[PDB]
Amino acid sequence: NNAATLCLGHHAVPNGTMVKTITDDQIEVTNATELVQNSSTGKICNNPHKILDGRDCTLIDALLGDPHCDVFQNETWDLFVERSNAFSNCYPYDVPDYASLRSIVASSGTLEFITEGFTWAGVTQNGGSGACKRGPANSFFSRLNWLTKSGNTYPVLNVTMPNNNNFDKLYIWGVHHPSTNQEQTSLYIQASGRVTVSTRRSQQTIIPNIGSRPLVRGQSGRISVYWTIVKPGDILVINSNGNLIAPRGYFKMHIGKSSIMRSDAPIDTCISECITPNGSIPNEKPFQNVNKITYGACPKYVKQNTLKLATGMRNVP
Amino acid sequence: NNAATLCLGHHAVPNGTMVKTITDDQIEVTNATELVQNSSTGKICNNPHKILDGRDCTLIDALLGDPHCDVFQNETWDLFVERSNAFSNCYPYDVPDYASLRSIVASSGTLEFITEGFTWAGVTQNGGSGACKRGPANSFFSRLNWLTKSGNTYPVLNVTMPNNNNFDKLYIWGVHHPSTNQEQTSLYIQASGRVTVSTRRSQQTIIPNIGSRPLVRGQSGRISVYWTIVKPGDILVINSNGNLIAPRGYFKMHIGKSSIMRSDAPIDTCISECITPNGSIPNEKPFQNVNKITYGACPKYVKQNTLKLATGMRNVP
Amino acid sequence: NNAATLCLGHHAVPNGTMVKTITDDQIEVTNATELVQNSSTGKICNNPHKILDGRDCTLIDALLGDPHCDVFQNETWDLFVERSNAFSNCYPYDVPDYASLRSIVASSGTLEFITEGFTWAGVTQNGGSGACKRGPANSFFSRLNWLTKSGNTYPVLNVTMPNNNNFDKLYIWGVHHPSTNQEQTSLYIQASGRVTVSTRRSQQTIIPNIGSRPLVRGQSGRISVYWTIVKPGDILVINSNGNLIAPRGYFKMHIGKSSIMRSDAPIDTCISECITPNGSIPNEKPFQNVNKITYGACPKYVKQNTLKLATGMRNVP
Amino acid sequence: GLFGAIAGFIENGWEGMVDGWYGFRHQNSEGTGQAADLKSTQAAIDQINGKLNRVIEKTNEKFHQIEKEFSEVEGRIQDLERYVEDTKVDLWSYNAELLVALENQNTIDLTDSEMNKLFEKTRRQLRENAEDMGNGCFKIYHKCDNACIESIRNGTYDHNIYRDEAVNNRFQ
Amino acid sequence: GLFGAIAGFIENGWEGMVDGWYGFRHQNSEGTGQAADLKSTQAAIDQINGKLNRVIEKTNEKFHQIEKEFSEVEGRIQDLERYVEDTKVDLWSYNAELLVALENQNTIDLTDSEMNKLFEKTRRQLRENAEDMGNGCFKIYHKCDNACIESIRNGTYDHNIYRDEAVNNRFQ
Amino acid sequence: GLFGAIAGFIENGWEGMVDGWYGFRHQNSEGTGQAADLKSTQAAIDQINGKLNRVIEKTNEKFHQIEKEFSEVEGRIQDLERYVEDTKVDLWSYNAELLVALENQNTIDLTDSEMNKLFEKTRRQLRENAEDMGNGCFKIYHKCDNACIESIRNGTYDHNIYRDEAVNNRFQ
């Protein structure tokens, strides 16, 4: 009682955590926190982003109008989810530079289609085929128009369609490559067609290529698909003496936050800013280990499955 | 006076600055300094880099020799400034892979053109047109040579031009696509031309493509432009039975610090290492917020409009 | 002896090192260590990676089967070393998109070639040429098959070859562009051939292009080369009325760590994980200044030739 | 740690103290006790919270980017796409390794500071009336009861009052 | 700060001192004064200047690069061009955020060091002839005039001379 | 350095000491000597070794990448290939500049800590039996021979034993 004892010190815990610093690979601490997000509920939340489930359709087939993708006409998305099990079921086709066509449409975020009064003088419109049925009936891509002969002549088509709009127009069209010359002439009279779509500033010319391809839905011909963008104040001009697969109109182009992702995750009602092909994820942590592919407000992909930040002092029990 | 008092301390200021550290979002300090450059005088200094104002001309039209770009023949630049208001005023054309042709010439840093004695036997040289006038008179790209028929025949052209130089030669040429067959034959006699420019190591063959394109300076045909590089010791061989738009010579290629920028900034007499499309900027600060596009010795573009580094201690008034 | 003197202190050295910190550009220290590797023995160690010396052959010529590259048939590599002094010595050729053909084969890591019973009905196989000799005798690329006429007709070839394998098949083929029409018909009867190789999902059609090219090993025609990949369960279909240079089979495709490097370094028996074109290097240091091009487990290329990390305290002699 | 207080001259931490990060355990005439110290316990909990996203953004928000997986081999262009990603991932993976290692060294250092600054705010108050035992406790050399301790803890303690008596019990 | 001198035990800074960063304000028999201390004021002004481009290059000089704005949509290749830039800009934008935050923590720490090292070069000179008041001032326990102070400041002060007299005024 | 021990109050380093990084040079009745101190010499050699690849990976292993040199001019695509590399190299070149500058500041600081923590483990043992000379040596105020020193060095020294005699030789 003529002396006392005052002691200074710090708290501690029974079970504390190990972290790393510039000077220990491991060192014990009182609290810690995980910076890497490494799991996913496995579902894709349908908010705040507008998700569009493609189901049995790829964006290009929805674009073109494979009859079994008619439900997707004029649709829109912030995010297009393409499904591994999707198939085509129309006349067989290829897209020189498919990856790009896909990208640009995905980014536009809309399939809004405006029909335009194309005058196709001296030819038959609305060709159909056995590869592309509507129930029992013969059909074709909704957004395209197969021009065949009329009488025993196919004249030289020469049409135009100015853009008096304040947005860009995406025109999609194609060229038919027949398998045997019987077919070339049975449809287009001429010996070897040609398709030349142009603007003031650009052009593309395509000669067909007769010959046999592996057989698909009873067909060994092919349609090759091409696109032309037409800027406000520019003009479009289609010019062909056979084999033109013609457009019926144009797609509105948009600028914005729109994209496309491949995933088999199911769509849920919930809220999540960050989306991965593996499903949505919380975006509270600065990092994530779930997928380098993402969409929205998302942590940064890194390689590590765990990183622990010290939220407290050194721990000595 | 049997004791004294000694005090140690530090300076301070009335109005000091706020900065950020690893441990305060804000904390007061005595002096500070801004690391991000966020403004521009708005002019492009014509030193120490050689600036070349394209004015009413794009680098390709200067290249090709649109009559209104004749002042730019044999010119050179460290930096080519392309102007938003530039136009073309010659026969209408396109350049498959324009972006690249543009890039490679911009990097070469010269339009030095060497004329070569091409022998073009059995044909008419110096074709001109109503789209490409020199005052009241009919004309054409200065660096190209429109070969038409002579008599009632166009023979098969077969010429060559070895490179006995120690630099690469850039050959520019084109192919004419006529609109109606009247024109195909009215000029080249044959039914459908062909152009095949080649080296020991590469080749390009172009068939024309008859058909109508939107009308431009009274013309609905088009010239497509192509380039061939010919290395020292390699040879060039041009071979065509119609539609060749021929070169008159070659462009010297260089290696060096040369480039091209799009900007509407005016050119000034002053000194500045760093150039942006927004005008020049001082390069004393390590960072800059003016433009991700730059040329010269420049700070690093970042997103932040301000970053303050502490040049003094903590400030307590 | 009624007092003592205890002294605390630190070690030092006669010649210590200079390093840099956040607060001195230079400051003396007791030991230091170099983090940048800046030299190379100059040899490429043949372990643990399988090195394959191409010698007088480029990977594409080895691929195609230039007679002087026959030793490389069915070979494999982790690393293909291509030599600056390599040459070709067969019929002259080009590869649209050579860089890519080269890359994909280099990555596959094998030239394993499987011959397949192609039936080529109504034509002559095993064409040879004066550009591509086997000793005194006339020859051709080992992996390709020059189809010429038989009788005074060349029929329309239409063949197929399904993939019932669980790996991808790489088919290589080409198209011959003759110089004069004498040759077109002297070999393929028709006036202008055509080659159309296809799968279920893709196709390529190539029209030849008659005309003269610079002369090479007594030839001014050219073969253009193309590849088709055929996935398991897909089918291949070749369809041509002249000018087809046919495949004899396919190359097995692999997935793995395989690549290709250009270097003139000699191959040694030793062990080194890291390889550069300049020769191998030790990978103990985190950085390296020898070459941005590397292969294997390698330090990170940086610009600096030296960086010194302090392994000891400050040094005051 | 850099000052060598925590796990340094102080052997140990008090697994009871569910009221604070720092504080005092006294032993006198009346008995003992234990009380939090909020002024330097707040100074760590304010430094450790404003240290998290002092350096990372409001979570960058990205939209349409490049494709990062492929069904088909393609060569040069896909080589470049893959390398662009691979290159970025390794740089963020390093940045986040180093971020943590630096933050963790600093967290651990700023706490070892906060302890050894409480000890020398206190050692300065008790002036010459007591001694640094060398274990983080001072030996007070006078009668010090429940309002004498509490006057230290709340930083108003008057050293003059006990100055003579404490030089007494000390050297006599 | 890490040592807790500046804005720590020292309440305040002297808005007059237009002659230095550190120094002394004395109060004795003759009156008072104030003088800069150049040796530790230079030690901060040399650490803070050689800390700027100890780490950034001689301003990297770039020439023809890739295009970074576009008139026309194009798809895959332009996707890749844009992503390459976007990717770089976000990495430099982080690097420069972190650069500053680290430099600023260090600047602030190296100054709080320089103050508390002047205090313990000085406390070591005055030895036992004076006492740490706990506010950054010592109380000198002897007659100390304009050349007695100046002998401290220029680090030649002889403590033996005043040793007995100063133990006197102290404990008697 | 941040505490100002090494190259600070201590003038110098002992170019003989081929047995350790820290330690003691004593001067008494019997003569003198010099001995390593392993406990704080190990504490630097463990901090400096686990600081190297605490932050760098198990050397990343790469395989087929993009081509980085070119025989022929090509334009847009090769512009992009070159820029992708150039961009990466400048980022790793910065990362490795900064890595070292930070590690080196820290190495130098953690050692200046380890010295000044040996001095205040020791100053705390000798308690009041001796004085801080201000040059890193204490003056012991009692008979201290080869097992009296060795009891300090091995941290078992009992200060009570010499307490009175040492207050004697000190103030009388």
mmCIF file of N, CA and C in Angstrom, chain C residues 184-218:
data_model
loop_
_atom_site.group_PDB
_atom_site.id
_atom_site.type_symbol
_atom_site.label_atom_id
_atom_site.label_comp_id
_atom_site.label_asym_id
_atom_site.label_seq_id
_atom_site.Cartn_x
_atom_site.Cartn_y
_atom_site.Cartn_z
ATOM 1 N N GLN C 184 -2.579 -24.150 -118.204
ATOM 2 C CA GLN C 184 -3.886 -24.433 -117.575
ATOM 3 C C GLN C 184 -4.483 -25.685 -118.180
ATOM 4 N N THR C 185 -4.541 -25.685 -119.500
ATOM 5 C CA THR C 185 -5.159 -26.739 -120.282
ATOM 6 C C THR C 185 -4.229 -27.925 -120.513
ATOM 7 N N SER C 186 -2.953 -27.662 -120.773
ATOM 8 C CA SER C 186 -1.973 -28.746 -120.840
ATOM 9 C C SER C 186 -2.045 -29.680 -119.620
ATOM 10 N N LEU C 187 -2.621 -29.226 -118.502
ATOM 11 C CA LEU C 187 -2.692 -30.055 -117.287
ATOM 12 C C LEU C 187 -4.117 -30.408 -116.806
ATOM 13 N N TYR C 188 -5.035 -29.443 -116.841
ATOM 14 C CA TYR C 188 -6.365 -29.606 -116.224
ATOM 15 C C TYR C 188 -7.548 -29.536 -117.218
ATOM 16 N N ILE C 189 -7.246 -29.540 -118.520
ATOM 17 C CA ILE C 189 -8.252 -29.533 -119.595
ATOM 18 C C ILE C 189 -9.200 -28.338 -119.547
ATOM 19 N N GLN C 190 -9.873 -28.118 -118.419
ATOM 20 C CA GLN C 190 -10.789 -26.982 -118.271
ATOM 21 C C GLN C 190 -10.087 -25.639 -118.495
ATOM 22 N N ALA C 191 -10.896 -24.589 -118.536
ATOM 23 C CA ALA C 191 -10.446 -23.239 -118.859
ATOM 24 C C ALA C 191 -10.035 -22.489 -117.607
ATOM 25 N N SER C 192 -10.737 -22.744 -116.512
ATOM 26 C CA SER C 192 -10.426 -22.089 -115.252
ATOM 27 C C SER C 192 -10.992 -22.904 -114.096
ATOM 28 N N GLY C 193 -10.091 -23.625 -113.427
ATOM 29 C CA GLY C 193 -10.434 -24.523 -112.318
ATOM 30 C C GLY C 193 -11.114 -23.902 -111.106
ATOM 31 N N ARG C 194 -11.265 -24.708 -110.068
ATOM 32 C CA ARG C 194 -11.961 -24.263 -108.858
ATOM 33 C C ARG C 194 -11.825 -25.345 -107.815
ATOM 34 N N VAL C 195 -11.621 -24.936 -106.560
ATOM 35 C CA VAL C 195 -11.371 -25.868 -105.472
ATOM 36 C C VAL C 195 -12.205 -25.494 -104.278
ATOM 37 N N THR C 196 -13.000 -26.445 -103.789
ATOM 38 C CA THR C 196 -13.945 -26.169 -102.713
ATOM 39 C C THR C 196 -13.886 -27.261 -101.678
ATOM 40 N N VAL C 197 -13.084 -27.026 -100.650
ATOM 41 C CA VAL C 197 -12.993 -27.892 -99.480
ATOM 42 C C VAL C 197 -13.940 -27.419 -98.389
ATOM 43 N N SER C 198 -14.687 -28.344 -97.794
ATOM 44 C CA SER C 198 -15.765 -27.990 -96.843
ATOM 45 C C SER C 198 -15.981 -28.993 -95.708
ATOM 46 N N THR C 199 -16.574 -28.504 -94.623
ATOM 47 C CA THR C 199 -17.117 -29.356 -93.574
ATOM 48 C C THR C 199 -18.624 -29.125 -93.467
ATOM 49 N N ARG C 200 -19.243 -29.691 -92.429
ATOM 50 C CA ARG C 200 -20.645 -29.391 -92.109
ATOM 51 C C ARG C 200 -20.798 -27.924 -91.810
ATOM 52 N N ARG C 201 -19.757 -27.340 -91.222
ATOM 53 C CA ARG C 201 -19.857 -26.034 -90.587
ATOM 54 C C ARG C 201 -19.113 -24.923 -91.325
ATOM 55 N N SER C 202 -18.127 -25.251 -92.147
ATOM 56 C CA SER C 202 -17.408 -24.228 -92.894
ATOM 57 C C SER C 202 -17.078 -24.649 -94.336
ATOM 58 N N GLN C 203 -16.530 -23.712 -95.101
ATOM 59 C CA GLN C 203 -16.110 -23.939 -96.473
ATOM 60 C C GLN C 203 -15.111 -22.896 -96.945
ATOM 61 N N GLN C 204 -14.344 -23.243 -97.971
ATOM 62 C CA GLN C 204 -13.465 -22.283 -98.611
ATOM 63 C C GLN C 204 -13.479 -22.579 -100.084
ATOM 64 N N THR C 205 -13.679 -21.562 -100.925
ATOM 65 C CA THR C 205 -13.581 -21.777 -102.360
ATOM 66 C C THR C 205 -12.581 -20.833 -102.959
ATOM 67 N N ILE C 206 -11.756 -21.399 -103.826
ATOM 68 C CA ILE C 206 -10.625 -20.735 -104.409
ATOM 69 C C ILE C 206 -10.681 -20.915 -105.911
ATOM 70 N N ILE C 207 -10.807 -19.806 -106.628
ATOM 71 C CA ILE C 207 -10.538 -19.825 -108.045
ATOM 72 C C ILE C 207 -9.066 -19.489 -108.265
ATOM 73 N N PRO C 208 -8.397 -20.259 -109.127
ATOM 74 C CA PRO C 208 -7.051 -19.915 -109.545
ATOM 75 C C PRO C 208 -6.999 -18.556 -110.232
ATOM 76 N N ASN C 209 -5.813 -18.209 -110.715
ATOM 77 C CA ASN C 209 -5.516 -16.882 -111.208
ATOM 78 C C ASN C 209 -4.332 -17.001 -112.135
ATOM 79 N N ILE C 210 -4.605 -17.117 -113.430
ATOM 80 C CA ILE C 210 -3.562 -17.347 -114.420
ATOM 81 C C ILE C 210 -2.795 -16.023 -114.590
ATOM 82 N N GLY C 211 -1.530 -16.106 -115.004
ATOM 83 C CA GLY C 211 -0.636 -14.937 -115.014
ATOM 84 C C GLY C 211 0.775 -15.254 -114.560
ATOM 85 N N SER C 212 1.715 -14.382 -114.891
ATOM 86 C CA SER C 212 3.142 -14.663 -114.681
ATOM 87 C C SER C 212 3.643 -14.030 -113.405
ATOM 88 N N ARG C 213 4.483 -14.764 -112.702
ATOM 89 C CA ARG C 213 5.074 -14.310 -111.446
ATOM 90 C C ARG C 213 6.580 -14.389 -111.625
ATOM 91 N N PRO C 214 7.338 -13.677 -110.779
ATOM 92 C CA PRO C 214 8.772 -13.756 -110.912
ATOM 93 C C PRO C 214 9.176 -15.196 -110.912
ATOM 94 N N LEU C 215 10.258 -15.495 -111.621
ATOM 95 C CA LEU C 215 10.638 -16.866 -111.937
ATOM 96 C C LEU C 215 11.412 -17.413 -110.774
ATOM 97 N N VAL C 216 11.083 -18.646 -110.367
ATOM 98 C CA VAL C 216 11.715 -19.334 -109.225
ATOM 99 C C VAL C 216 11.860 -20.815 -109.505
ATOM 100 N N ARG C 217 13.078 -21.313 -109.256
ATOM 101 C CA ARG C 217 13.539 -22.660 -109.673
ATOM 102 C C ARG C 217 12.914 -23.090 -111.017
ATOM 103 N N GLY C 218 13.089 -22.231 -112.017
ATOM 104 C CA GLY C 218 12.537 -22.445 -113.350
ATOM 105 C C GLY C 218 11.028 -22.392 -113.475
#
